[PDB]
Design a protein around this ligand. Structure first.
Ligand code: A3P
Length: 258
């Protein structure tokens, strides 16, 4: 009745799209149980070698009628993950949360920047990295940019899973008006509606929504972005545009990105 079960839904990406926030909010649902921290199972040969059972026992204990959800942003880009997850459970449900490509790229860059300053190291401005100095065009070799070409990655995943097993969460809307996005996830997971407006409240100070559990229990989630040359922002937007249209067409969800 109380056992460690393999996840039936995995948030495979995208980093900086709001994966942590999505996981925390879904955890508001009485039938959802979240795996603590990222386990890095499918994207790490050392751990993947220990077998599915080691993975299973890293999951929290839950009841038969509950669904365990793991969050692992790196899975989206790591080339070998799809086949491994497919082997383990070909009917697994996959969640992808995304936001405006350019914005996500800058957020990605910002985290990498903070990581280097912490260790007291040097780094270049976003522009120097996202734009080829010579041609003055978008640098497609830069991961922050490549990770934002959502369609390219989804294509790999579609080689193993039907589009029906994926659900795309609008991360921009998750920030401004959460409930509707969470309600779609509830239906995607075959869960009855239980998350309510009472569970979410806007914190003008933090600038985001925070979670409200009990009567005296509120919880907010654990960055200052750099100003980018309006000109660079414009080139990136135009660059992503056609990939964005492909994304909407494949997923069925139009996200209205600039
Ligand atoms: N309620 C919330 N609290 C904090 N960040 C939220 C949020 N809802 C969405 N987010 C977004 O989640 C992003 C982090 O994504 P991930 O958890 O996948 O790394 C943040 O990027 P920024 O820090 O650039 O604003 C933030 O914009």
């Amino acid at each position: 009745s109380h056992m460690q079960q393999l996840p039936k839904a995995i948030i495979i990406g995208v980093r900086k799209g709001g994966t942590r926030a999505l996981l925390e909010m879904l955890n508001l649902h009485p039938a959802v149980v979240k795996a603590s921290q990222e386990i890095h199972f499918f994207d790490n040969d050392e751990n993947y070698g220990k077998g599915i059972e080691w993975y299973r026992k890293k999951m929290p204990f839950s009841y038969p009628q509950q669904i365990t959800i793991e969050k692992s942003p790196a899975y989206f880009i790591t080339e070998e993950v799809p086949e491994r997850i497919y082997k383990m459970n070909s009917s697994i449900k996959l969640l992808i949360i995304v936001r405006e490509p350019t914005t996500r790229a800058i957020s990605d860059y910002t985290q990498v920047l903070e990581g280097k300053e912490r260790k007291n190291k040097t780094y270049y401005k976003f522009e120097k990295l996202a734009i080829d100095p010579n041609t003055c065009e978008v640098n497609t070799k830069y991961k922050a940019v490549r990770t934002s070409i959502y369609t390219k990655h989804l294509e790999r995943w579609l080689k193993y899973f039907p589009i029906e097993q994926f659900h795309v969460v609008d991360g921009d809307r998750l920030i401004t008006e959460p409930l509707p996005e969470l309600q779609l996830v509830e239906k995607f997971l075959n869960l009855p509606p239980r998350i309510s407006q009472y569970n979410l409240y806007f914190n003008a100070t933090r600038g985001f929504y925070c979670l409200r559990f009990n009567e005296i229990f509120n919880k907010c989630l654990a960055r200052i972005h750099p100003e980018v040359d309006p000109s660079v922002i414009t080139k990136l937007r135009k660059f992503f545009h056609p990939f964005n249209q492909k994304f909407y067409q494949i997923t069925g969800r139009t996200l209205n990105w600039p």
